[model samples]
Target chain A: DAGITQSPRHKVTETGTPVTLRCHQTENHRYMYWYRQDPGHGLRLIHYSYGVKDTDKGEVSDGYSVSRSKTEDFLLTLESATSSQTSVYFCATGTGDSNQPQHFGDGTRLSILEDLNKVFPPEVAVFEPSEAEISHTQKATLVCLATGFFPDHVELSWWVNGKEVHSGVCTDPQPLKEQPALNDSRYALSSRLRVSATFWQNPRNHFRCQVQFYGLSENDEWTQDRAKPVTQIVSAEAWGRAD
Target chain B: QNIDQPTEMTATEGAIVQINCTYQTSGFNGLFWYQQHAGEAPTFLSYNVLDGLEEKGRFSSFLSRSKGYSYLLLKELQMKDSASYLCAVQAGSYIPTFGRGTSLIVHPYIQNPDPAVYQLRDSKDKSVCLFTDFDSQTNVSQSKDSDVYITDKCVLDMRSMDFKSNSAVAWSNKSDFACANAFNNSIIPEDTFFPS
Candidate 1:
């Protein structure tokens, strides 16, 4: 993959002003997108391009307008700037279809009055299932873990036979620590959901474990089942009691 | 180019990967990334590789492949990260070829907001004060200008004056008057219609 560049890595403007963020790609990929990040509101779509001169509105396409004159560039213009419009903006390019993850730029930090910094927390959740094969009355424990973050806020929950279980929940908060060169602070946390269900008997049942993120209003959820023959259940008694 | 060398690459399930690729080939092509968001149509392309590493907020890419196989990595992996990751090969061809993407399912210890929410802030910021929704039952302006009216039904008339460089004309369900130009193209003006 060869083309993608975002200009104005950082910008500052008055409260009532006009700003234009540019996303340019050399490959002419046909699809382009613009998104913004905030504390409580997660990442939201601002605008997107299907092709040259053809575009559509995303869930949050109100004040922003986009224009795609050529195949390689997509422009996002804020008609009038507000204190609330201050955020880190990003541009992405893709083939115009689904079943793939969008590549991201480092992001453009925009501020109204307060200074904005881009933070990539060290902690990142990694989910892996052993296999899809489970035996009757087999004990299993699903694991969700991340390493970079400190002062951890970890949680785990299970869903058995389509119903959510409260007892099997586990949560732990890690101590905070300083991270060098990475800019902002970092933390790490992990959670495990234990269940005694038999995969061979109820392979159709789905088990889900979610982690509650701090500072942002979003949760990471992972689900796996034994319906697929290759899926395997990890030992539960080996791990210990649920939190 | 030596056809004898094999390209090898690896990435953790949810960690962001950037496949380094540099080739002396003919013609220009587009770079691209695709995503399947669970039950919805996998018809959405996550990112398209163009001239630069396009940042949609969190994910990013860079091409410098003399070091070996081109790679794709995931950052801030979540359960939603369980989808497949791919590296598209755009070689001047209209249709690009996709490498088998690395499948990722993040069992995150903490839930981070969906990367998609980054797109919402810009759009929501634009509509902070204006009440454009039709169900509100309040009579507002009808044209791009901000002329107040007593009724909710209004027609937009664009023939009145010359639209300045940055002016925009939009209709409203709040009033019945169709011709109204609010502020003369001042950025972020109040409920005025026919903005220039």
Candidate 2:
């Protein structure tokens, strides 16, 4: 394993406070860099240092400063922490050669506590299958949509009969929309799970969609929305024939 | 520590190629695919959680959690698909562990003949040098154990360069080098050497 490490794995600070994150490596690589990970934006570089006492700005270098006094340590400081600066910051090292892969350290989750609106929990909803889907197909699809969340590092899981279902599930890789045009900072994603027609037809069977939102801080917990039970009565004529 | 993939792969222009990746992790959440062109950052391609296939345009990713196997399939491939493909696994945490990416070389018809960078060595004295400017060509001849190696213009056809002393360049003109024994040894001088 690469010997890169980041300090203060989890941090909670207030607005206007100075926050400094440290990245130390045992391997004396020629290149050391800092990046912030955010939803929709992916990983944006904050700053990079080519060698000791040498540094340059990256795409998202605003409000952030970096220093490399030695080959083993690179420090990133937020001059004045803002609500928008809350993100998972990652540190990486490379040989400064083309085609050489960079080694990354586990990120530091920096949370600015004064920004309450930036860490909203997601609202989950599980949609039921239509009668046509129940009658015509061997399996019915259930959609679970989670909306209005921030940071967007959430995970969606489907449970049936009190056990987690692993197969026949699909989730959006990233959030679909942040809706900047509407002045909304919240993000949304959807996950779909398929259940056998026979399984759905059972009156006692219940399916639930659970969303675990990994928020800016560690306070957020799992938010769940259980879909309504499949109690729709399908007539023999509707099962065999269609308009 | 649990991911595996090939170091290099080659494919034709119109043919489909699958870059295979296998991993073994405890709390397997999902498998993600990323594509990185030379000198550029890696971009997200697709992700798979359940034991099935997920398609995104010309790229399809498959994950089998029970068997700990995954693959990225490129269909109707174009020359632009030539890049490094990285497969990462996210287990218990949000942090992802990436594999040493697979170098995918997608050629138009023949392989991309000119490698952008060349690492050459000497046959007689075991001297070495790295190069990027081979278009104007370099005739590096360093004989002794000394650190000095001279570079001058020697317009030798790369195809005719020898592989006897491991004096071979690569195929693609990308950041990563791909070693292929496409060069002939007899036509190249014994002193000017290269690495496979």
Candidate 3:
């Protein structure tokens, strides 16, 4: 096993406090990386190091700094932490290659207190099969469920053939559920986007469901693709006619 | 030395191609795979010589002798998969020269959760404090070894400890802490800790 570790896994500070996250490795590998994970968005790259005394910036390297003195250690420092900087931070290392999957350490959860009134709830989507239909023409309803979101500012839509579908309504604010696997949060909100479109024999006609939240940019869309049949049903009418 | 050059490819003045490798250098080496993780040291994933394809875990690396180029391929992203990746070519030496890495980010299917940080110390005396934390979400741990008297900062030795699957640690400063591979029977000399 490659020796790797990160420090300050959990940190709580004021609005303008200085924070430093450390990623230490014993393997003396030549590359290192830093990223932050926020709700609705993927892990954004912050910074990385190629060799001793060598470093570079990533997509989201702003407001952050890194240093690598020896071959084994890389450090990430946040000069002045802000409320927007509150997110899980992760450190990883890889042998220099574009195709290799980087190994990740447990992340650091940082929180600030500037905008306490603003509720930044995380959104989620899930799908499940309902009926067992044999024909492609039989109507299939794929539900795009959303949770831990602000309902008033949330809207769900369906995308088929690259076009948006205008349907469905928010029933009501449901009770919060528990999601211990993600994090031990007290609340879990949910909603759904149902699409009752008939499946066709062709694979290109499959649909994808997307959910959008108001007050956020267009990039905040949560999407889920339709699940298709594992086996092909050549003709239900042929089976019926043969019987 | 010029950072602005779009594609600067040159050899260092005197230093030979080190091919900084992880696997025990034994026989036949032309191209190697270098993977970069966010905020951590690089690791050797695989190597290729012939031509064609080689698959390991979720990654596949390829090397072409005629073109003197190599690459790696990663599929099905996960949050644990976010990190920088690199491709290094072995230029007839033990040390490997590495290319700039590509950062990888895998979005979580569920909402991201708050992270937890932990601190570890070698003893209560605090003379040899090793700040360590394990991320339960990603199952990665980090620790740093620092000497408070000399410098508040620390640089962790990546080879000093053993990280089991789903485990990680981070160090603050490199010079302050002591390293001993208790599990591997590799011991850091006492003089290495406090050099006179």
DockQ of each: 0.02, 0.01, 0.01
TM-score of chain A of 2: 0.60
lDDT comparison, 1 vs 2, better candidate: 2
TM-score of chain B of each: 0.36, 0.58, 0.40
Which pairs clash (backbone N, Cα, C closer than 3 Å) in model 2? B162-B185, B167-B194
Interface root-mean-square deviation, candidate 2 = 28.3
Query: For residues A1-243, what per-residue lDDT tens digits would candidate 1 score against the true structure?
Result: 345677665555444567788888876777888877554332467888888998887757888899999988899988877777877776878775433445555467665432122222233332322222112113233434333332222333445555656443343322222343343345433343434434312445555544432221112111323121111122111112221
Q: Candidate 1: misplaced stretches above 4 Å?
A: A114-243, B1-196
Q: TM-score per candidate, in order?
A: 0.30, 0.43, 0.32
Over 4 Å off, model 3: A98-101, A115-243, B1-196
In model 2, what is the error at residue A238, expressed in angstroms? 25
**Which lDDT tens digits does candidate 1 get at residues B50-117?**
44444555566544333323333456544345454444544411333344344443333212111100
TM-score of 1: 0.30
lDDT (10s digit) by residue, model 2, range A87-187: 88878887754323466786777767564444556767655543444543344455555766654555677777777876655554446444544443676
lDDT, model 2, position B67: 91
